[PDB]
PDB file of C-alpha atoms in Angstrom:
ATOM      1  CA  UNK A 835     -17.673 -19.418 -15.315  1.00 27.54           C
ATOM      2  CA  UNK A 836     -14.758 -18.005 -17.296  1.00 28.86           C
ATOM      3  CA  UNK A 837     -12.157 -15.606 -15.813  1.00 31.66           C
ATOM      4  CA  UNK A 838     -13.662 -12.727 -17.808  1.00 29.66           C
ATOM      5  CA  UNK A 839     -14.703 -10.428 -14.962  1.00 30.30           C
ATOM      6  CA  UNK A 840     -11.918  -7.887 -14.394  1.00 29.45           C
ATOM      7  CA  UNK A 841     -12.358  -6.561 -17.941  1.00 34.01           C
ATOM      8  CA  UNK A 842     -12.888  -2.877 -18.740  1.00 37.20           C
ATOM      9  CA  UNK A 843     -14.995  -1.106 -21.367  1.00 39.24           C
ATOM     10  CA  UNK A 844     -13.587   2.299 -22.320  1.00 40.62           C
ATOM     11  CA  UNK A 845     -14.651   2.207 -25.970  1.00 42.63           C
ATOM     12  CA  UNK A 846     -17.199   0.372 -28.123  1.00 48.49           C
ATOM     13  CA  UNK A 847     -14.894  -2.495 -29.041  1.00 44.18           C
ATOM     14  CA  UNK A 848     -12.535  -4.292 -26.671  1.00 41.33           C
ATOM     15  CA  UNK A 849     -11.337  -7.670 -25.398  1.00 41.40           C
ATOM     16  CA  UNK A 850      -9.613  -9.470 -22.522  1.00 41.24           C
ATOM     17  CA  UNK A 851      -6.089 -10.780 -23.090  1.00 39.07           C
ATOM     18  CA  UNK A 852      -5.617 -13.826 -20.851  1.00 37.09           C
ATOM     19  CA  UNK A 853      -1.819 -13.966 -21.177  1.00 34.44           C
ATOM     20  CA  UNK A 854      -1.903 -10.350 -19.983  1.00 36.73           C
ATOM     21  CA  UNK A 855      -4.705 -10.819 -17.450  1.00 35.81           C
ATOM     22  CA  UNK A 856      -5.754  -7.254 -18.290  1.00 35.95           C
ATOM     23  CA  UNK A 857      -8.312  -5.551 -20.525  1.00 35.36           C
ATOM     24  CA  UNK A 858      -6.894  -4.616 -23.919  1.00 36.43           C
ATOM     25  CA  UNK A 859      -8.599  -2.756 -26.765  1.00 36.36           C
ATOM     26  CA  UNK A 860      -8.837  -3.772 -30.425  1.00 35.99           C
ATOM     27  CA  UNK A 861      -8.986  -0.342 -32.065  1.00 34.97           C
ATOM     28  CA  UNK A 862      -5.817   0.797 -30.301  1.00 37.05           C
ATOM     29  CA  UNK A 863      -3.931  -2.219 -31.661  1.00 35.00           C
ATOM     30  CA  UNK A 864      -5.382  -2.075 -35.178  1.00 35.36           C
ATOM     31  CA  UNK A 865      -2.894  -3.606 -37.594  1.00 33.88           C
ATOM     32  CA  UNK A 866      -0.897  -5.386 -34.896  1.00 32.90           C
ATOM     33  CA  UNK A 867      -3.394  -7.339 -32.798  1.00 32.93           C
ATOM     34  CA  UNK A 868      -4.183 -11.045 -32.166  1.00 32.98           C
ATOM     35  CA  UNK A 869      -6.922 -12.962 -33.985  1.00 28.19           C
ATOM     36  CA  UNK A 870      -9.481 -12.044 -31.314  1.00 24.33           C
ATOM     37  CA  UNK A 871      -9.231  -8.408 -32.421  1.00 25.67           C
ATOM     38  CA  UNK A 872      -9.468  -9.455 -36.079  1.00 26.27           C
ATOM     39  CA  UNK A 873     -13.119  -8.378 -36.118  1.00 24.70           C
ATOM     40  CA  UNK A 874     -11.886  -4.779 -35.821  1.00 23.06           C
ATOM     41  CA  UNK A 875      -9.032  -4.239 -38.285  1.00 24.76           C
ATOM     42  CA  UNK A 876      -8.365  -7.441 -40.229  1.00 25.70           C
ATOM     43  CA  UNK A 877      -9.602  -9.841 -42.915  1.00 29.37           C
ATOM     44  CA  UNK A 878     -12.660 -10.406 -40.720  1.00 27.31           C
ATOM     45  CA  UNK A 879     -13.787  -6.842 -41.440  1.00 24.90           C
ATOM     46  CA  UNK A 880     -11.121  -4.503 -42.818  1.00 21.08           C
TER      47      UNK A 880
END
């Protein structure tokens, strides 16, 4: 269905950035990440 197939899982939490077409993490960008990674370090959680 979706284009989510070339993603990579190095840690427990991660995500796929379309605009980048690559697999980006959420913990590595804590504090300066999109809304998708809000569940890691943001109002959604912290």
